[PDB]
Amino acid sequence: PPGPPGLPGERGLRGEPGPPGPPGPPG
Amino acid sequence: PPGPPGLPGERGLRGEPGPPGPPGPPG
Amino acid sequence: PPGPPGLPGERGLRGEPGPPGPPGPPG
Structure with a gap:
């Protein structure tokens, strides 16, 4: 099976x- | 063999x- | 076996x- 996605950045x-x-x- | 490498995060x-x-x- | 984890986002x-x-x- 495909590997898990990386964690969000x-x-x-x-x-x-x-x-x-x-x-x-102004003054 | 191990599956496809996972998607990037x-x-x-x-x-x-x-x-x-x-x-x-200052004014 | 499952694929390796994807790289971090x-x-x-x-x-x-x-x-x-x-x-x-104030001026």
Whole structure:
């Protein structure tokens, strides 16, 4: 009989941090 | 003789979203 | 006998970039 399938792969790496936030309120 | 070699595993889950970015620049 | 186990699955895709950071300090 055929062999069993391999186990599912490991979960991917976490994504990169997001970009900088928008500028604060004008002076 | 032993049967056909098993299928490769399923691709892993997508990684988690990245962390929120750093605080934005001063106004 | 049963076939040998398939190879482990490929690691999942890297996660998406994180959201934008918090708004910056007031000017």
